[PDB]
Scaffold this active site. Structure first.
Site, PDB file in Angstrom:
ATOM      1  N   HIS A   9       0.810  -1.215   0.000  1.00 27.71           N
ATOM      2  CA  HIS A   9       0.000   0.000   0.000  1.00 27.71           C
ATOM      3  C   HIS A   9       0.846   1.269   0.000  1.00 27.71           C
ATOM      4  O   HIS A   9       0.318   2.357  -0.167  1.00 27.71           O
ATOM      5  CB  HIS A   9      -1.034  -0.001   1.112  1.00 27.71           C
ATOM      6  CG  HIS A   9      -0.504   0.433   2.437  1.00 27.71           C
ATOM      7  ND1 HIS A   9      -0.240  -0.458   3.453  1.00 27.71           N
ATOM      8  CD2 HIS A   9      -0.235   1.664   2.930  1.00 27.71           C
ATOM      9  CE1 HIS A   9       0.191   0.201   4.512  1.00 27.71           C
ATOM     10  NE2 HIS A   9       0.193   1.493   4.227  1.00 27.71           N
TER      11      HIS A   9
ATOM     12  N   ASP B 212       0.100  -7.447   1.808  1.00 23.93           N
ATOM     13  CA  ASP B 212       0.519  -6.055   1.779  1.00 23.93           C
ATOM     14  C   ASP B 212       2.025  -6.012   1.879  1.00 23.93           C
ATOM     15  O   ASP B 212       2.612  -5.722   2.927  1.00 23.93           O
ATOM     16  CB  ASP B 212      -0.126  -5.279   2.919  1.00 23.93           C
ATOM     17  CG  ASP B 212       0.072  -3.787   2.788  1.00 23.93           C
ATOM     18  OD1 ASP B 212       0.563  -3.358   1.723  1.00 23.93           O
ATOM     19  OD2 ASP B 212      -0.249  -3.066   3.757  1.00 23.93           O
TER      20      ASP B 212
ATOM     21  N   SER C 157       3.746   2.884   8.013  1.00 27.85           N
ATOM     22  CA  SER C 157       3.399   1.821   7.090  1.00 27.85           C
ATOM     23  C   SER C 157       4.572   1.446   6.252  1.00 27.85           C
ATOM     24  O   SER C 157       5.317   2.312   5.795  1.00 27.85           O
ATOM     25  CB  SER C 157       2.287   2.270   6.156  1.00 27.85           C
ATOM     26  OG  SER C 157       1.103   2.378   6.884  1.00 27.85           O
ATOM     27  N   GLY C 158       4.724   0.147   6.043  1.00 27.32           N
ATOM     28  CA  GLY C 158       5.808  -0.345   5.220  1.00 27.32           C
ATOM     29  C   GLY C 158       7.029  -0.665   6.045  1.00 27.32           C
ATOM     30  O   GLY C 158       7.920  -1.360   5.594  1.00 27.32           O
TER      31      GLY C 158
ATOM     32  N   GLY D 166       2.176   6.605   8.545  1.00 27.95           N
ATOM     33  CA  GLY D 166       3.534   7.057   8.294  1.00 27.95           C
ATOM     34  C   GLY D 166       4.543   6.006   8.707  1.00 27.95           C
ATOM     35  O   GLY D 166       5.696   6.063   8.300  1.00 27.95           O
TER      36      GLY D 166
HETATM   37  N1  LIG Z   1      -0.862  -0.107  13.833  1.00 27.60           N
HETATM   38  C1  LIG Z   1      -1.804   0.736  13.415  1.00 27.60           C
HETATM   39  N2  LIG Z   1      -2.781   1.040  14.160  1.00 27.60           N
HETATM   40  C2  LIG Z   1      -1.679   1.347  12.063  1.00 27.60           C
HETATM   41  C3  LIG Z   1      -0.409   1.464  11.498  1.00 27.60           C
HETATM   42  C4  LIG Z   1      -0.259   2.043  10.251  1.00 27.60           C
HETATM   43  C5  LIG Z   1      -1.391   2.490   9.588  1.00 27.60           C
HETATM   44  N3  LIG Z   1      -1.231   3.061   8.396  1.00 27.60           N
HETATM   45  N4  LIG Z   1      -1.834   2.628   7.331  1.00 27.60           N
HETATM   46  N5  LIG Z   1      -2.022   3.483   6.465  1.00 27.60           N
HETATM   47  C6  LIG Z   1      -2.601   3.117   5.263  1.00 27.60           C
HETATM   48  C7  LIG Z   1      -2.745   4.103   4.294  1.00 27.60           C
HETATM   49  C8  LIG Z   1      -3.296   3.758   3.074  1.00 27.60           C
HETATM   50  C9  LIG Z   1      -3.678   2.441   2.843  1.00 27.60           C
HETATM   51  C10 LIG Z   1      -4.266   2.090   1.521  1.00 27.60           C
HETATM   52  N6  LIG Z   1      -3.894   2.744   0.418  1.00 27.60           N
HETATM   53  N7  LIG Z   1      -5.104   1.157   1.474  1.00 27.60           N
HETATM   54  C11 LIG Z   1      -3.535   1.449   3.813  1.00 27.60           C
HETATM   55  C12 LIG Z   1      -2.976   1.791   5.036  1.00 27.60           C
HETATM   56  C13 LIG Z   1      -2.664   2.375  10.137  1.00 27.60           C
HETATM   57  C14 LIG Z   1      -2.818   1.806  11.397  1.00 27.60           C
END
Ligand SMILES: N=C(N)c1ccc(/N=N/Nc2ccc(C(=N)N)cc2)cc1
Ligand SMILES: [Ca+2]
Length: 223
Positions: free
Chosen positions: A40, A84, A177-178, A175
């Site tokens: 993502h 993912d 993520s990844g 932020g």
């Molecule tokens: N551990 C968490 N609570 C948590 C950590 C990271 C997070 N970020 N995700 N962001 C995120 C942003 C976009 C997508 C998408 N294009 N589908 C998916 C996820 C969201 C939640």
């Protein structure tokens, strides 16, 4: 990372920042030419920033290397976030030393209860928004699949695991993520998703890297 701590500069040497004019995702360096991140996080024109601590200041240990290619998992589903995971190849090999280092792929899946280190430059607030400039860290246990599924009915696939704290307060966040979830020196997870951050009974959901090692290796072998 919500409720974490300042890692310390270059203490998480495999942590990369994916930069497209700004940090937008984490990643984990898994060899000199390859970064694993979340599918993502895919976007073209990624510059991988290695050796970062403060992502807003050149501090002297950075390597900025543009991606030459990104490979999103063949079965990535952006609706469910199943699979993912994405590989990013660097245009040139990162220079590896103690501050920039690859993280080992798992040879086995980690169990619930294993303590892991989750890191990133994501939001540090569960309510509202504050982005740290230096890398944040969180020690978090992998949660049981049952607790994971209970927290997120109908959403947790075999390619996901939960980690963190059901009580909330401590989690990865937007932020991050990844970025990596490293347990016993192995990359076991990729920050994937979760409902908000650090919310009660909404732990972080992580891509289960151990499921992808074959794909990662064979992809690397041919790309
Ligand atoms: N551990 C968490 N609570 C948590 C950590 C990271 C997070 N970020 N995700 N962001 C995120 C942003 C976009 C997508 C998408 N294009 N589908 C998916 C996820 C969201 C939640
Ligand atoms: Ca920097």
């Amino acid at each position: 990372i919500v409720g974490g701590y300042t890692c310390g500069a270059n203490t998480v040497p495999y942590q990369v920042s994916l930069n497209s004019g700004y940090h937008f995702c984490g990643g984990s360096l898994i060899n000199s030419q390859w970064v694993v991140s979340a599918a993502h996080c895919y976007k073209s024109g990624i510059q991988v920033r290695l050796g970062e601590d403060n992502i807003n200041v050149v501090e002297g240990n950075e390597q900025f290397i543009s991606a030459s290619k990104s490979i999103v998992h063949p079965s990535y589903n952006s609706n469910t976030l199943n699979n993912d995971i994405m590989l990013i190849k660097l245009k040139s090999a990162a220079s590896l030393n103690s501050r920039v280092a690859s993280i080992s792929l798992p040879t086995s899946c980690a169990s619930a209860g294993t303590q892991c280190l989750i890191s990133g430059w994501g939001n540090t607030k569960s309510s509202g928004t504050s982005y740290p400039d230096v890398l944040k860290c969180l020690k978090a246990p992998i949660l049981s699949d049952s607790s994971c599924k209970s927290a997120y009915p109908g959403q947790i696939t075999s390619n996901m695991f939960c980690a963190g704290y059901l009580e909330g307060g401590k989690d990865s966040c937007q932020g991050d993520s990844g970025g990596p979830v490293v347990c016993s020196g192995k990359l076991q997870g990729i920050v994937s998703w979760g409902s908000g951050c650090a919310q009660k009974n909404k732990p972080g959901v992580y891509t289960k890297v151990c499921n992808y090692v074959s794909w990662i290796k064979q992809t690397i072998a041919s790309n």
